[PDB]
Design a binder for this molecule. Structure first.
Ligand SMILES: O=C(O)c1ccccc1-n1cccc1
Ligand SMILES: [Fe+3]
Ligand SMILES: [Fe+3]
Length: 301
């Protein structure tokens, strides 16, 4: 409950609504009187929740024409096979690499595995479309997405968190759908938690490019809701600072003979509580481990 953070389902702006759970939300954009779009692909088990929320705003689901995806992680595309059947006119917009992940049986295997762990006991999933059969359209870095007469979003490559990650910038509204590129926003402390799970140099380089965007009014990550005011304006820069802060912290620990597992457990214990309801505890601890391993390699003797 903060002035600068909208974290409740429902309407966020004149054109924007939050569907489903705030920790893994799906955002709804009204492009016109009979045209809508979705942003972020959530987790599979939320199919019926998101669908329920959606139908309360969209009388005719055939008016959903676009579904924008930031990256291939299980918590950002798990809904696609299960709701695309119910969205006959939708077109999934994703980066080339993100599309490649859906044509890989091994990559799909991991996405499905992690999502099934989040299923409640006796919970059944709808009739699902084949991952390789999704109505996808690959988008490239810098491409402009003419979604509607008042919605023009630019695709900006933002690798680092993952090797396929992109973000979507609505310059008209100074609004950035940044996915996980800035990390995980700490709701209790008001700072960003870095999520460097692929490449640190690219991670920092992406934040440098995003800092050069015109001053943001709304910052919408993959988890936690909508950020505004100074949080949006300073977002990219603050996320950059917090990443370096974690690096220096890592170097300090290692220089004291500490093993990566020592700080991993500490990060997991201090940060794993926010994502417990949609992220298996072993995945978070392992993710923290993978991150520190990345930072150690790209900053060590
Ligand atoms: O990206 C995240 O949302 C995330 C955050 C914390 C730990 C693991 C994560 N993860 C890694 C791969 C898919 C989820
Ligand atoms: Fe992610
Ligand atoms: Fe994520």
């Amino acid at each position: 409950g903060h002035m600068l953070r909208l974290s409740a389902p429902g309407q966020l702006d004149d054109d924007l609504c939050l569907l489903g759970d705030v920790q893994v939300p799906v955002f709804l954009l009204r492009l016109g009187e009979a045209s809508w779009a979705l942003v972020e692909g959530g987790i599979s088990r939320d199919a019926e929740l998101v669908w329920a929320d959606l139908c309360r705003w969209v009388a005719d689901p055939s008016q959903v024409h676009y579904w924008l995806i930031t990256h291939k992680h299980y918590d950002h595309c798990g809904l696609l096979p299960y709701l695309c059947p119910r969205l006959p006119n939708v077109q999934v917009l994703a980066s080339e690499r993100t599309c490649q992940a859906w044509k890989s049986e091994s990559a799909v295997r991991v996405v499905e595995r992690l999502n099934r762990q989040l299923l409640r006991a006796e919970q059944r999933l709808p009739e699902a479309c084949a991952w390789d059969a999704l109505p996808v359209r690959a988008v490239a870095d810098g491409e402009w997405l003419e979604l509607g007469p008042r919605h023009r979003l630019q695709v900006i490559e933002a690798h680092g968190h993952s090797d396929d990650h992109v973000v979507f910038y609505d310059v008209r509204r100074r609004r950035l759908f940044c996915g996980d590129a800035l990390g995980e926003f700490d709701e209790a402390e008001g700072v960003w938690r870095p999520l460097v799970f692929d490449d640190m140099e690219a991670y920092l380089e992406s934040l440098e490019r995003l800092q050069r965007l015109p001053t943001l009014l709304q910052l919408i990550p993959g988890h936690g809701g909508l950020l505004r005011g100074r949080l949006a304006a300073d977002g990219a820069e603050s996320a950059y600072t917090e990443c370096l802060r974690l690096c220096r912290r890592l170097l300090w620990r290692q220089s004291m003979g500490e093993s990566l597992d020592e700080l991993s457990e500490e990060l997991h214990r201090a940060w794993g509580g926010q994502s417990v309801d949609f992220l298996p505890g072993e995945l978070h601890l392992g993710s923290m481990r993978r991150m520190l391993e990345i930072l150690s390699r790209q900053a060590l003797p």
